[PDB]
Amino acid sequence: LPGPDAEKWYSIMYPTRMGTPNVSKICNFVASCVRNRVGRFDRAQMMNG
Amino acid sequence: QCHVCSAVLFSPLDLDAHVASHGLHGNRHITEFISSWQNHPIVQVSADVENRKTAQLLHADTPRLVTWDAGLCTSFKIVPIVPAQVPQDVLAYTFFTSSYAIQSPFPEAAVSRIVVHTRWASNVDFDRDSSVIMAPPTENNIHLFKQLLNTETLSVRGANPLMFRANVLHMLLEFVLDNLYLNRHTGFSQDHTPFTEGANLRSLPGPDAEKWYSIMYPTRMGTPNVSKICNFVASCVRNRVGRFDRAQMMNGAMSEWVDVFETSDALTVSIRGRWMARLARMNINPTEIEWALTECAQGYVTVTSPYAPSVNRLMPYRISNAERQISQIIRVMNIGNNATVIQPVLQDISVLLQRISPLQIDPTIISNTMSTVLSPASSILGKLRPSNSDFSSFRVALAGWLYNGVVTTVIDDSSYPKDGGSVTSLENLWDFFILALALPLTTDPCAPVKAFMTLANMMVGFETIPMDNQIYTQSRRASAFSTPHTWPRCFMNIQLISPIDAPILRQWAEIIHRYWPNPSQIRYGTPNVFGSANLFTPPEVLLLPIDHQPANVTTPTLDFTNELTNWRARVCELMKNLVDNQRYQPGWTQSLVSSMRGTLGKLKLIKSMTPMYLQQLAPVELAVIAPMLPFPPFQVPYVRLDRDRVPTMVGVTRQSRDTITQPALSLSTTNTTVGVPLALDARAITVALLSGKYPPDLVTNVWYADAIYPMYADTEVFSNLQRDVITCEAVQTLVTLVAQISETQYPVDRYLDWIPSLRASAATAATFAEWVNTSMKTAFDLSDMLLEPLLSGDPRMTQLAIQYQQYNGRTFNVIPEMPGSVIADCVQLTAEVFNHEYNLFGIARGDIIIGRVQSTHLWSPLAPPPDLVFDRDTPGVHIFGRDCRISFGMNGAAPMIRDETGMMVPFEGNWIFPLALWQMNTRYFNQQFDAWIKTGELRIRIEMGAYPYMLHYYDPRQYANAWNLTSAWLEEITPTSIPSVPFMVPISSDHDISSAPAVQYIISTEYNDRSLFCTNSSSPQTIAGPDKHIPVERYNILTNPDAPPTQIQLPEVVDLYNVVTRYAYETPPITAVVMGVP
Amino acid sequence: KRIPRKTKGKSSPATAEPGTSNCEHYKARPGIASVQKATESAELPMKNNDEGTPDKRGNTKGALVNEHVEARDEADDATKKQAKDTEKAKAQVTYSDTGINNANELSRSGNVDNEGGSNQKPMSTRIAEATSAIVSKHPA
Ligand SMILES: [Zn+2]
């Protein structure tokens, strides 16, 4: 997404992308989450380019 | 002069260079043409040569296929790693007073490795500048694996492990693309050395010849001393040296092909053999060339190409329609609704057709015919403007017949009558008359509908016709009938137009239905040799919306048989009927009937030769021009009036026939018409039709024999053939390579699966395709476009295809099945070879194990003892998934980490980590684990699949610790980049040495040290350290006595001593003698 | 003999016979010169349309403009070039303002990517910003 910066947004948007090194509550939740639900999964492409 | 081509030479001593083109070995040109009736030779040179002294140019961006090579064709050299010199018992050979020093075929060093330096020792006339060069394994080579998409990473001295496969594939592509050379027949020399007595030897062009014998002839040195090299030499045979056999086709005193024994490698010799076969099978004959030209000239010009019989001549100009059509499709996609692309082609063809055509247009004919001194005889003359000499619209319309499927020529909106119009106004009637004679020459799929509806519009208010719905009244501008789905039922069926209500309009519809011109076709080109790039049509026809006839200039000018003259007469008679009784011109205070009828008759009958020219001679000129065009005609069938069979859309498909994917229509289907629309001014076309004369002395044989010669002396078909060959090769290579990194459905057998990679997306595939395209372009030395339109829009394709649809949903899918491609086949072969000898390129298969090994034993980490390694079947191991959660242990408790099964284990034992685990969080781990690996019991196996490596040789008699290197690697493996795995291997020694402890941490799981050539090459034996003799199986044809000199075990192991075929062709320029037909 | 490279690569007794004559006597009606000039003009090859293709780093080449707007602009440019070639202030053949409603025409530009998304931020910067979030640093 546009703006002066997006590094914070890449972490806020996708909770299940962070690594799981600890045994903290956030880490436990991320580990309990499902791995294959991130970003786009469907699209409607009609014309090349 | 020369008695072969009747060419005049100023200096008789330069006749040898001229006859060299005909093929006579007496004692830079690309095309040489001679004219029979005149003294004006025409020659061609490439577009960038010199001051261009009265020579034409070859503007095609031709590739360079025929490239020679005078040198040994090996690609793997042998380099020393740790040099060492030893005492010798024999120093040199002596012959009377003189003495000669001993030379060794292999470097005398403690250890030796095989690296890859393609064309390291090669003398080439034209280098392709591509190279795969490996530094010795002691140095690091990561620039070759961070090539393609490691644009931004977190460490400059690292490579992304998730993207190794694309880099390896592109490296193999370079390795096979820069070895496309033909061996050459440089001279030989005898040898009376007491070891190679009587055997011929090859000499290389350069400073010294005796320098290059120890290399390429290992058996020239005998067995003076007792070493491993001497032991290897003593086992080979003494008769497989130098020349094997030659040919009976002697050129002067030197043969024209030869087989020799010298150092080489099977991969490159097979690649060059396949390239030789592909180049040889494309050969064409001068007789074929002359036949093609003489039957392309349409019988107006005959050519001849004399030559001498010689087998050793090569000129690749023969292709197939399958390869001819793929490039046509690529060129069609190149446009992409860009009028700037198509404007120069049409403009240049218009100019060339105007220059060639004998028909010259002078508007003075109309002024003379209408001898005037407002009146209808003056309004028409003021409207056609017989003073403007710009008639480019007529020639552009003529040139547009060749590109029906690309561009549609329509009458400009301004030409139609203003704001509707009424039969009431003289000015308006003339606009209609002008439009009516110029409409039939357009390529618009629906011209007659506009022609009928313009008069229907002008006639509103006087007479009416029925309509289909209350949305479309009769007063509807004819400019909106640009699509076949709007043809009125009254126009498609006359009987609904009642003669009681609309007699004049019914007559107009009747005349359109019967006397509208009908299409035809004409033969052209040479399908036997030049192929055919035409789609949706039979491969030897041009389609024309005009019925052609045999060409004779004596036909009557008022011949009411040709469609154009018949159409003019019918339109004029209909206008006479319209204006005869003055039922449609109220308010005309005079009786202009007489003047109007006089003008209409005087314009109906006129001595205009343009209809005859269009009927007879113009198709001949179009058929002559068409084969030589840079853009071969792309044509869609003309239907005269059948609404059922009117094409509407043309598209290009990338996916396969049996796939269910995203519907991605090509950008060419977005046009409202079948192609890109352009507008023409009907006034110029009408003036051109009404005025035109032949020169007062026209002999068509002389005129065309004279005109064809300059335009055939400057041809580029012979270069477009190599162009589309290269295009087809690139297309196949691209589809195969992208299919091996994306999960497309193309059925290639995969050999590089063990190398880690990711599912390539659209962007990754596009970047890889761009790199492949630019590598091929650089290798074949061209700067124009190829494969570039395929880069746009998700280039995860399977096969190229083009199709067009009719009005009633009917389609026509054209799928040109393509033959094999030597580039892709050789890529597959070198992938097979790499699958077995990956270690030669600096890639180690398997994975590494991290753990403390403090012992005084001497073995290579690449070849470890069995007990040190462990796998998933070893009892007590712990396999780790992604969800590893390190928990601290308080009150003196040991820390715990999460196994894949949910159980927690301390930092001790044997573990199995995927590389992704450490790569994800490399900072948390080494903080927690490095203290337990240095002086602990933790042992970790990191499964990686394939990984680059570099070696660090250490002296085995002194203390050495690899903790610094291991810690540097562990701290430098950040996400999106890994540095090469560091290894610490001992040094082989031929003398007994002492032992010192050595701490090692990184050891390979499986065997990876198969790139080691030999250890202590200049010593009787190896006592301490890794032992390795000279690899016998690689020099198979020398050791194995009952082995034919041709057999090679290429798929398993490359053998670096083979028989190579060397020869010297020559490529004479395209010569032709043009003669005129009486 | 070394053939120079076209484009930069990766690293970067006797008697005169009675028949021979050396004086011309014929002048061609379709002139040799006239035809050659036109031929070399038609002989000029096709223009490359590199718009929309990715670069070495992955950024798509071109200018950020709407697709139909780019198509109309290049149609106008083609009309101007036709007028210049025809050396008249007004061009008879126009690829623009044809009179056929062509409002669905699309021509490649730099606005779209291969993944069907906008190019407001060049791709390399998008990948760099994504990877940045993941990075961690040495413990304080
Ligand atoms: Zn000759």
Automatic annotation (TrEMBL), chain A:
What does this chain do? Inner capsid protein that self-assembles to form an icosahedral capsid with a T=2 symmetry, which consists of 120 copies of VP2, with channels at each of its five-fold vertices. This capsid constitutes the innermost concentric layer of the viral mature particle.
Instruction: Give the protein name, as stated in the record.
Output: Lambda-1 protein
Species name: Mammalian orthoreovirus 3
Q: Where located?
A: Virion
Coiled coil: which residue ranges?
none
Portion of the parent chain present: 394 to 442 of 1275
UniProtKB/TrEMBL annotation, chain B:
Give the species.
Answer: Mammalian orthoreovirus 3
Kindly provide the name given to this protein in its UniProt entry: Lambda-1 protein
Question: Its gene?
Answer: L3
Residues recorded as binding Zn(2+) 1, renumbered to this chain, are C2, V4, H22
UniProt key word Coiled coil: no
Q: From the record, give the transmembrane residue ranges.
A: none
Query: What are the BP-aspect GO terms?
Result: 7-methylguanosine mRNA capping
Q: Which domain of life is it from?
A: Viruses
Tell me the leader sequence span: none
Annotated keywords: ATP-binding, Capsid protein, Helicase, Hydrolase, Inner capsid protein, Metal-binding, mRNA capping, mRNA processing, Nucleotide-binding, T=2 icosahedral capsid protein, Virion, Zinc, Zinc-finger
* Cell location: Virion
* Gene Ontology CC terms: T=2 icosahedral viral capsid; viral inner capsid
